[PDB]
Symmetry: T
Subunit: 150 residues, 12 copies
Amino acid sequence: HHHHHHKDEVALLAAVTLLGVLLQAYFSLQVISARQAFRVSPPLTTGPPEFERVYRAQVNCSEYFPLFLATLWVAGIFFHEGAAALCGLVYLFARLRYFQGYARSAQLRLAPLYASARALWLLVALAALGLLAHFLPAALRAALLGRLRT
Amino acid sequence: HHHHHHKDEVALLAAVTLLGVLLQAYFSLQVISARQAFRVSPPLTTGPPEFERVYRAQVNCSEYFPLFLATLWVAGIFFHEGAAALCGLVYLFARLRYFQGYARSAQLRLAPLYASARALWLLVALAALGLLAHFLPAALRAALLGRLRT
Amino acid sequence: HHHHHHKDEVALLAAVTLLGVLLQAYFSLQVISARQAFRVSPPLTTGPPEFERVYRAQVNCSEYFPLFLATLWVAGIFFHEGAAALCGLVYLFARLRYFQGYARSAQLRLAPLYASARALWLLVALAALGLLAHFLPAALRAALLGRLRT
Amino acid sequence: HHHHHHKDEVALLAAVTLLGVLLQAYFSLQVISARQAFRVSPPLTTGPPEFERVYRAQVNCSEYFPLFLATLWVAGIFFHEGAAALCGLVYLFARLRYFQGYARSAQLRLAPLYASARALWLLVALAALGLLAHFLPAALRAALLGRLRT
Amino acid sequence: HHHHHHKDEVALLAAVTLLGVLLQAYFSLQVISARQAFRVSPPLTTGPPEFERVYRAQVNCSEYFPLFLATLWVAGIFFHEGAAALCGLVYLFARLRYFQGYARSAQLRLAPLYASARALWLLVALAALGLLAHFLPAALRAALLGRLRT
Amino acid sequence: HHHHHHKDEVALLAAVTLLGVLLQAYFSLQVISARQAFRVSPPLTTGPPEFERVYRAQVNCSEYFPLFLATLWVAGIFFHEGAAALCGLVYLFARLRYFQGYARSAQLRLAPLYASARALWLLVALAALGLLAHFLPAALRAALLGRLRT
Amino acid sequence: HHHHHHKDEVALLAAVTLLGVLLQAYFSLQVISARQAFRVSPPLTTGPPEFERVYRAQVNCSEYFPLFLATLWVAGIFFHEGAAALCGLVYLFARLRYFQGYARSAQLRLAPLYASARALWLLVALAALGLLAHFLPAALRAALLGRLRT
Amino acid sequence: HHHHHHKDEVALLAAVTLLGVLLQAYFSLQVISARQAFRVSPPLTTGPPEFERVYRAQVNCSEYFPLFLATLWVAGIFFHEGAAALCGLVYLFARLRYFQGYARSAQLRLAPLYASARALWLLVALAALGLLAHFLPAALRAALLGRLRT
Amino acid sequence: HHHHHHKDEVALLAAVTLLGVLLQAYFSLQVISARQAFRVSPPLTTGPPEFERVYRAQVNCSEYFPLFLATLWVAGIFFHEGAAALCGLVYLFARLRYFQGYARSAQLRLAPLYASARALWLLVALAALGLLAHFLPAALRAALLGRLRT
Amino acid sequence: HHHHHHKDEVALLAAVTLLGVLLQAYFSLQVISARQAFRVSPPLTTGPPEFERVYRAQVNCSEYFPLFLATLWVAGIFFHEGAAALCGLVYLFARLRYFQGYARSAQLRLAPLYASARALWLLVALAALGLLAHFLPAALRAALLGRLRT
Amino acid sequence: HHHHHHKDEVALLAAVTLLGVLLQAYFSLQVISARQAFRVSPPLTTGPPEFERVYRAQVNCSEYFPLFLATLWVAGIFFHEGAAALCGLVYLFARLRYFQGYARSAQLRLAPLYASARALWLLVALAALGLLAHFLPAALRAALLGRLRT
Amino acid sequence: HHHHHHKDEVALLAAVTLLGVLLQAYFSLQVISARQAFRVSPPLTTGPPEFERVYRAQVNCSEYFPLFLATLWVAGIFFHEGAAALCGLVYLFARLRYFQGYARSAQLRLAPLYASARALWLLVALAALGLLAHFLPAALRAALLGRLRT
Ligand SMILES: N[C@H](CCC(=O)N[C@@H](CS)C(=O)NCC(=O)O)C(=O)O
Ligand SMILES: CCCCCC/C=C\CCCCCCCC(=O)O
Ligand SMILES: CCCCCC/C=C\CCCCCCCC(=O)O
Ligand SMILES: CCCCCC/C=C\CCCCCCCC(=O)O
Ligand SMILES: CCCCCC/C=C\CCCCCCCC(=O)O
Ligand SMILES: CCCCCC/C=C\CCCCCCCC(=O)O
Ligand SMILES: CCCCCC/C=C\CCCCCCCC(=O)O
Ligand SMILES: CCCCCC/C=C\CCCCCCCC(=O)O
Ligand SMILES: CCCCCC/C=C\CCCCCCCC(=O)O
Ligand SMILES: CCCCCC/C=C\CCCCCCCC(=O)O
Ligand SMILES: CCCCCC/C=C\CCCCCCCC(=O)O
Ligand SMILES: CCCCCC/C=C\CCCCCCCC(=O)O
Ligand SMILES: CCCCCC/C=C\CCCCCCCC(=O)O
Ligand code: NI
Ligand code: NI
Ligand code: NI
Ligand code: NI
Ligand code: NI
Ligand code: NI
Ligand code: NI
Ligand code: NI
Ligand code: NI
Ligand code: NI
Ligand code: NI
Ligand code: NI
């Protein structure tokens, strides 16, 4: 405190962030479950293809999760909160489908992997466009001021 | 600048965040050390069970680390900073114990894994409760206003 | 809204964050490419050393990426934005070199790994120094006030 | 010779038989092609999953091919030639789809495997019904004649 | 059509043929069942000895099945239909016992393998004797006619 | 019975069929012999290359055997019995050479594999030409009758 | 010495003991022989299933041999010498059959394994019954004497 | 017979011996059970770590069992029956704990392994002390008698 | 008690027995030491040949140890105590040499293995000769008494 | 210098030597090429049979190359330069054929291996015959001179 | 003897030859050392990549060593002694660097491998040029004399 | 020609060289023989330890053979022919013993390996001493002449 809160500017991003965490928790619980079913004890991460697909689907989602969080917040702050949150939901729903598909079949990971890549690339473009709108005017002005005497 | 800083609202979260990073650095240095001791050179991540346990303990802590960070910040902003920071410390101390236990024995990972899951689930619940307190009143009001003419 | 934005206080951190994401995207696309070249289909993450090095270089960069993001933001907020952003650029350029080197040879990962560790440790020290400057004066004052009657 | 030919009673069965052979030839040429692509030389029948799927799809089609031929001819002679030939075409088209699907993905073999099983079971039932119509009347008559004095 | 059918000359052969197909169907369903029980997914044909024995028993029966069909029909047409059908039943019952025995133990395959070989060799001898009775008289006559002038 | 036999129309096909069976029996006895020599007990089908070549040569001959039988009978009935029987003998002699060559060396399988493929493709073409001669005239007539009013 | 010998009280146990040793010697000589035949040199204890079965049959007999000796002597001293010696002979003859069966086939070990377990359990029960007869009367008397005043 | 029995001098040793046998029987039944659960058929003694731990725990107990029996009897006869029997019970209870611990985790074998070693070493020391008391006086006397003339 | 002890009749056997136990303890401590040196953790019993030789030497000594104990006691009681004890010492010294040799080289196990076999076979022959002297006179007398009337 | 050169006595040997070196260079370049084609990177010398055959053919030629050089020079100096050079050319041409054959097929190495062995054995015999002509006369003379007085 | 020595014409070649031998001795001692460090006992030539690189570097140097010696002597005799000796030193220094580099990293073998190939190819060209100068004039003269009458 | 031969100065070196070649031929024939006995076909160089020891013993002798030849000739020319030839015989006899020993046991290679190293090091020292005697006087003279004016 402060007699103002910036919570109302990031609450959709925070909600989509928490949903992402819950989805990652779900993937982790499904791996523990596959370990039980296929009797693959730590420290092993190999076993039958069906176990390896569940393990790998979770590990893939986990590798991309910080990329998702980073670009969600940057796009949400610099471009538009609602648009970023919406691309974020689409990304997470695609990730659920990727995990479910990949667990059934390596080939079934591909369609939802492409949908998740499209949603993440869109977050990347919105983040980039917002950062450009932030930096470009001051930079072009400073260049122009430089050329002004001449 | 700005003639105000929101640093004083997130400094415990930032301190617990930095402690988390230092702990992850420690786990990484312990893997490099196990590589030396067991002569397992990159790109290999397999070798004797004792090397694999150290590798896996670090990789597990690393997978969950962004989940920890995400929920720490959301709970700290939307619920209560001190409570979030405290659950965060408990989580990180549990993770230290998980890493140390798992390195000695797969079975010794389990008790501290459960303690870390309890602390992370508590962060999740506090984040959820704070987001509910943020969104629910405006939503119930809007629903009611809708029903008002009738 | 709010009639003020804290965007101007974190825009360099956000830009370096987005660059980090783009670099991680690049590493991921290079793994997909190595999968094609060496015919290593998911769920496999093993194959010839040359494939394993590309896979491992990406996975290593990915493990450290949240540590990078965490300390970049904490150092940028609590110490100095421009200094944090600069150490961050140096870190990311070192990571590019690590990935390129490791793909050619395990041994070629080492020099740029050390440069990335130096840049990350510097971010850690700046974050720590900023948090100390935040907390230490109030703590020493409170200790002193305690001793004052005596 | 003979001043009659029974060719006109089995020409659809013979045509569907020849189509089956051509389809098996196709599967064999696709395995030779996969051997070239994946550099798997005889006597090896193992290699990457993608090679093994092509090999296995052909071997599976080959195991069932004599079952197909046997029941096609028995159903065609004892039940109805056109019906047997039609179930036979459906079976072979399902087998093409099984081979193509299985080569892409183990999971993609399943739908067309079920369609081929339905067509083969139908040939089995028609063969059984025709053999029953052949044998049952004489058998029931002989049983009855036996009971007649009494 | 034709105002005569040759169905009555091959109906026992066709019935024994259909029984052979049903038995091969049974072996195939037992392999699918062993895949489920031992979690061996296609394209794999290896796993624990107990799975491999079920797989191999089916594959062995399948390799010999066209030899069985070929000699059943040739012996049934050229020697005697009832005798061929009877040796055929004995062969198929021996094959059932081979499959059941081999699934329990490699060693238990041997006694019924020998009984199936005896029944198949008998079909071979009957086929050979019928073909000799078909060709030998005309050949000896033609040789004699050749020697007749001299 | 019947006061006529169609045996005299298929006796060369039946003789070549029986020779094919005897040749497959020979290949099977040679595998049992290689099992003894190299001490490879069922359910194993792997061992030294020299055992695997004998196993594979037999399995290859067995996969193609129903294709051989099918096309031999269709070409023999629809095209010309003596021509089909002759291509059939050539095919079987090529298969003997394939088995003997492959057992000595993978590379030695190739020349006789090509000779067997040429003989089998010739049977396929004769079968196709006979089926065309059977079906084409009635089909062209029916098409023409259709066009006749116009 | 002593002007008495307790040899006459244990000579059947000693004879059955010596027979057990000779049988274990036989099993050991058969393993050395299997090593020669299958060319499996120490320190290896793995090789083809046929070698492993001979090795394992001997190792199993060896693990149970001290259990046999212990219970033979305890039953022979505390229950009845002739009965213990007789169960002991039955056990050893069952063990010979177990070794011979297991060497031929894993499955053939089972019937004689069960017969050896029945004979060993009988020795266990006789030993237990003899020890009960030894200890129970004095214990029940001491309990009763305790209750006597009351 | 004999009008005396030495049964009363060894009945505690015999009872502890029989308990040892029953405990070894228990370990063996637990291995058979682990074979069923993990589908590891003889002659295999390898499989998942969880099966191998149960197998190894039993094999370890079995290797030491004759050492236990030997020293139990020697200490019980030459030192003191009750003391030997008591160390023996402690040893066997420690072995139960070793088996149960090792089955859960390799690391959990260690504490009860040390307790079993302490109890076995104590039996060894009591056996040694009893044998010294038996042999030393006569030996020192004989040495002294030798020195006596001088 | 008893006013006599049979300790003086078996004290050399008991001493040689205890020495055997101490030697087995030594072999076990050397395996634990090889586990440390070669980093082979339980439940593994495989690793480099040098570890496997130490493991196997101990396991071999352990398998034969109950055979040694059994025949030592039977020969010592039924033939001559001092002779049995002496063959026993020779056997144990040969076993020490076997363990030391085998640890250095598989081939170095052979000479001392043969010396241990000679000493054990001698114990076997002395045990057999003592049991014959025990049983043969009464048996020949009983046979003769049977023949006496005639 | 010297006002004479012994170059004219060994120039054919030197030319055949240089040709041998060029041929070994060729074999080495073909291995580097096979490494590229089959993606087998150093330090690996294993991979598909087709790579291993190229590697092994070169390594075999390399092992025998010093034997070739040694005997070429000794035969060329002690027997006859032109004859040695000619056997040497024949040997090298046989080695080219061995390398080319072995690369295609293990079996194709054999005929040219035998031709190279014949040429090398001939060089050996010429070297031996030349050394005999050098040493035998002086030795027989010295023996004779020894016998001369007598 | 001889009242002249050709030692002064080859002493630099002999010195460079001896240096080559000493360098090969060094490589061999470094392999023995790597065997000790990585516990890889003969007959094994495989182990961790770091051991395999040391082994392979030595084996590669050894394969090329006779090519080096052959061309060093031929170039030194037929072209120029000092030039050959100098290229030889350069080659050997490059080989030292190849061995040292390859031991650290496969990739580090490449630069010095290329330098050694350049020095060896230069020796080859000098040897070829010297042999041409030896043979070409007499050959061109003989061809010309042949053409002279015409 | 030349009216002198330098054959009489190198005939012992040539004879020892030829003996070395014959010994290498023997080692090669023994490997071909081990391939037959253990059924290890090219391109394989792995199999049971007993085959690998024969292979490795030959390959080791082959690697050192050019070192032997080089130093034999240099020591024989620059130091003393008879001494070099004698060390050479000793070396070759040691190599025979190394091959024979290593084939029986890895450990048995060591004593004769050391004897061969001593003989080869002696050849190295004699070669070095002869080259020093060749070069040192002229070098010291040239240095002295340089210092002479001063
Ligand atoms: N290096 C030996 C020498 C014995 C030899 O030269 N064998 C001939 C006939 S089996 C061969 O072609 N060896 C094949 C190879 O060296 O890869 C070997 O491994 O075989
Ligand atoms: C747990 C998930 C929370 C969901 C957060 C998003 C809630 C509603 C998002 C929709 C906002 C859309 C704003 C309009 C964007 C546009 O114009 O495209
Ligand atoms: C590096 C670690 C920094 C530690 C950050 C936390 C410092 C004190 C945390 C305690 C705050 C507790 C506030 C009260 C919460 C409650 O009522 O439960
Ligand atoms: C995509 C990358 C964006 C780059 C963000 C950084 C842009 C300029 C950074 C330089 C700021 C340096 C401020 C001075 C720091 C110092 O004094 O050391
Ligand atoms: C190569 C393929 C040849 C095709 C053989 C079949 C040609 C036409 C088949 C259709 C006949 C259908 C007859 C009617 C059967 C019914 O009433 O269901
Ligand atoms: C599904 C199985 C159908 C059974 C076909 C056979 C039915 C009866 C076969 C017996 C015919 C025997 C004829 C006599 C042969 C002989 O004399 O040996
Ligand atoms: C066991 C093998 C039986 C052999 C069957 C064939 C017997 C003779 C076949 C030759 C018939 C050739 C007829 C002429 C064909 C043509 O004109 O090309
Ligand atoms: C080498 C083997 C020695 C055999 C030892 C046993 C000799 C005879 C044993 C039979 C004794 C049976 C006594 C009667 C037991 C009963 O009543 O059941
Ligand atoms: C099946 C187990 C049987 C148990 C055997 C032991 C029964 C009681 C043992 C206790 C005897 C203790 C005697 C005193 C020893 C001492 O003074 O320390
Ligand atoms: C720990 C080892 C204890 C040693 C036990 C043996 C002590 C002396 C044994 C020698 C007794 C020899 C008696 C004579 C035997 C004979 O005549 O051959
Ligand atoms: C690069 C290769 C150089 C070739 C060296 C040989 C050149 C000609 C060799 C033939 C000399 C033959 C002399 C006659 C030998 C004989 O009588 O058999
Ligand atoms: C152990 C190494 C011995 C070194 C042998 C070489 C000693 C000096 C070599 C230099 C000779 C160079 C002669 C000039 C060659 C040229 O003109 O290029
Ligand atoms: C095939 C082997 C040929 C043997 C070559 C050597 C023949 C005799 C060598 C002995 C010469 C010894 C000369 C004396 C050396 C010295 O004084 O030590
Ligand atoms: Ni205020
Ligand atoms: Ni201001
Ligand atoms: Ni603000
Ligand atoms: Ni406002
Ligand atoms: Ni007619
Ligand atoms: Ni009629
Ligand atoms: Ni008809
Ligand atoms: Ni009495
Ligand atoms: Ni007594
Ligand atoms: Ni001069
Ligand atoms: Ni000269
Ligand atoms: Ni002179």
